[PDB]
Ligand binder design. Structure first.
Ligand code: NA
Length: 404
């Protein structure tokens, strides 16, 4: 059963609704509020019921994201209601058909050259944006220009970012200038949800990420990024444990410091067993790929190599990655998303999926100083100051690639 606010998303556009004159809808707020899937479900229903033989856009951060977030559950949900769907996977569009009417649903990604090629010359009767805060503004300005058909409606879905983000400033602060409907979603508005489940999700977030992703507020990112890092909780003695599995995580720099960190699984908790930290500036000598490889072997001398599951490493360290693969070391290219990895590291800290041996001294010094970019947040870009973040980037590469 859908909530009252979920049903307002499904029914705002119908003739009987008192808000059907609006040029579109903005649904934002918390995670797991049942807004994305029903918003997309309503979008298609609206488009099938209102036009015939027209084009409709649906957009995500990338197309793969858009498919796993939106299209996959949207398809099964459409099929069970009697909508016949033909997913044209390679061409990235769909045809949907219902009561004799047929429309075409093109899939886009904000950061894709295929998408930015097709968005130049297409005529649309509506546009849908999932994760709209994560997309580039220029793409969204250009996408809305392609909605020239008579009676086109723009639909926007996202999670909160900062107060100076272009979507807050240009769209949410100018609702009635653009004749847009706005509905805000907390976890109260998803009925398939016990408090036990809701209060479990409350425990996962603290600070800015709690205020954004649980409360649904557009709060500014300021000061200490991991302000939930407690040494009462996350630090442990440096003693041996019978670990069942291992990884090494790597932040690479000849210019800057290089860092290895050894991770070990024990009772469903990952432990940063030890750290390596070489800085060429302060040591007054720089290391080659070969020398770091030699250190990496010394660094993993003692662990049983059937338990060692490989090395995680930055995408921009390919001469190191090439060398390691000639030595037959399994290398995982790190996922590399900065804001999503910072979120997951913080969640792994809150949940205590990770702990740290008290020998990880450089990592703790970096926790105390890693801060948000004050000047960038006031433009609307949430990002760290990239200074003393080498152990913390390696740790992020680990948590985001293996845990999440
Ligand atoms: Na670094």
């Amino acid at each position: 059963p859908f909530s009252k606010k979920q049903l307002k998303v499904l029914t705002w556009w119908r003739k009987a609704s008192p808000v059907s004159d609006k040029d579109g809808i903005i649904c934002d707020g918390s995670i797991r509020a049942g807004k994305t899937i029903v918003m997309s479900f309503s979008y298609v229903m609206w488009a099938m019921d209102t036009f015939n033989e027209q084009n409709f856009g649906m957009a995500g951060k990338t197309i793969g994201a858009l498919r796993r977030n939106v299209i996959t559950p949207l398809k099964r949900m459409l099929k069970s209601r009697g909508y016949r769907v033909k997913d044209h996977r390679a061409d990235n569009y769909l045809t949907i058909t219902f009561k004799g009417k047929t429309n075409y649903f093109y899939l886009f990604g904000g950061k894709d050259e295929s998408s930015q090629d097709l968005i130049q010359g297409i005529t649309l009767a509506g546009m849908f944006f999932d994760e709209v805060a994560l997309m580039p503004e220029s793409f969204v300005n250009q996408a809305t220009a392609r909605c020239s058909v008579d009676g086109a409606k723009l639909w926007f879905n996202c999670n909160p970012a900062g107060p100076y983000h272009w979507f807050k400033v240009e769209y949410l602060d100018k609702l009635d200038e653009k004749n847009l409907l706005h509905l805000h979603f907390t976890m109260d508005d998803n009925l398939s949800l016990s408090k036990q489940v809701k209060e479990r999700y409350q425990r996962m977030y603290k600070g800015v990420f709690y205020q954004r992703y649980i409360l649904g507020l557009w709060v500014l990112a300021e000061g200490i990024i991991y302000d939930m890092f407690d040494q009462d909780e996350h630090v442990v003695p440096t003693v041996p444990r019978p670990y069942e599995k291992y990884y090494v995580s790597c932040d690479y720099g000849t210019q800057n410091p290089t860092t290895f960190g050894l991770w070990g699984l024990y009772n469903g908790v990952w432990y940063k067993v030890k750290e390596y930290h070489y800085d060429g500036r302060k040591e007054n000598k720089q290391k080659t790929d070969q020398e770091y490889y030699e250190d990496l072997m010394k660094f993993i001398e003692d662990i049983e190599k059937h338990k060692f599951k490989g090395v995680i490493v930055d995408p921009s360290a390919a001469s190191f990655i090439a060398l390691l693969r000639q030595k037959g070391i399994k290398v995982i290219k790190a996922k590399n998303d900065v804001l999503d990895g910072i979120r997951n590291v913080a969640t792994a800290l809150n949940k205590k999926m990770i702990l740290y041996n008290d020998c990880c001294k450089e990592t703790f010094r970096e926790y105390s100083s890693y801060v948000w970019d004050e000047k960038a947040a006031e433009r609307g870009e949430d990002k760290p100051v990239k200074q003393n973040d080498h152990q913390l980037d390696a740790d992020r590469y680990f948590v985001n690639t293996i845990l999440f």
